[PDB]
């Protein structure tokens, strides 16, 4: 019998699809990894369960433990879903700038929300989470930007899925960097296994921190943290490509209309970059894997 015991056993094992029309000028093959096939429609499902599994396996989860994380993105959604499956109490902090729709989605999974001053952005959500953790020892904070289970799950699952499904033929992996876990985990495994493989990090042109620029506001959700995440191994990254807001939005829209792939803005951004790499004649005949991190419907 093939029956999952709970929804967390159905995380990962996402498929690859060849891009057919959003390929203008490509001389390389572009295939997309569809992370919206995860049960809560984003790549973060992988780390939501990984960081909690890791904590359980390390005996850090106690009878009175409350899961707590500062996040206005998919990590909150993933954690909320995994806590619902696990039967854990989930508390999330985020600026009151978060949409009402997103709040409703988190509450639907039974997460509890602590809204922080809109003007204070993420630092306010983080500060509140830091204080709550200090004053109450029941709180367990996954710390997605520093937790080693983040890149680790990507080594064990994401990287192997890419390796197997391409039968080892993968030449280049293109991925947007939020926590940096996806690209790091995949590089760690594939680059050791196939030293000729190359890895392209993607970030917003409006917030080109990995390139040496400064933090700025940008709409490409899931990427562009405005700092270099500890989890990222910048020495495995062979290239950074910046992507503008319009190009990201345009290509995201092209993916839905021309490929039937309704994906988020960050998927547009990663594909902008995969398209740019695919146009280089030295990459003729190569196989490029681009990670599409989430589903488009979330972005109404």
């Amino acid at each position: 019998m093939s029956i999952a015991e709970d929804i967390t056993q159905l995380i990962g094992r996402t498929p690859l699809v060849r891009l057919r029309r959003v390929t203008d000028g490509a001389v390389a093959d572009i295939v997309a990894k569809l992370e919206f096939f995860n049960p809560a429609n984003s790549v973060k499902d992988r780390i939501g369960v990984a960081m909690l599994q890791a904590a359980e396996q390390a005996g850090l989860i106690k009878p009175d433990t409350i899961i707590l994380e500062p996040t206005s993105g998919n990590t909150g959604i993933a954690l909320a879903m995994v806590c619902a499956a696990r039967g854990y109490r989930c508390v999330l902090t985020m600026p009151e700038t978060m949409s009402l729709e997103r709040r409703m989605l988190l509450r639907a999974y039974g997460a509890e929300l602590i809204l922080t001053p809109g003007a204070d952005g993420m630092s306010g959500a983080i500060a509140k989470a830091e204080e709550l953790a200090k004053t109450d020892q029941r709180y367990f904070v996954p710390q997605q930007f520093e937790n080693p289970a983040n890149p680790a799950i990507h080594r064990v699952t994401t990287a192997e899925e890419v390796w197997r499904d391409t039968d080892g033929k993968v030449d280049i992996v293109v991925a947007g960097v939020g926590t940096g876990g996806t690209i790091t985990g995949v590089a760690q495994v594939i680059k050791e296994r196939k030293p000729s493989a190359r890895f392209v990090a993607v970030e917003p042109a409006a917030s080109p921190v990995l390139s040496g620029g400064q933090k700025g506001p940008h709409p490409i959700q899931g990427i562009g943290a405005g700092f270099v995440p500890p989890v990222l191994d910048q020495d495995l990254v062979d290239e950074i490509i910046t992507v503008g807001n319009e190009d990201a939005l345009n290509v995201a829209r092209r993916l839905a209309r021309e490929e039937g792939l309704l994906v988020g803005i960050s998927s547009g951004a990663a594909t902008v970059a995969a398209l740019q790499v695919a146009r280089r004649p030295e990459n003729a005949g190569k196989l490029i894997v681009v990670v599409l991190p989430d589903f488009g419907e979330r972005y109404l």
Binding site: G73, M122, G222
Partner: peptide, 4 residues
């Protein structure tokens, strides 16, 4: 601000 960032949404991750």
């Amino acid at each position: 601000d960032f949404s991750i």
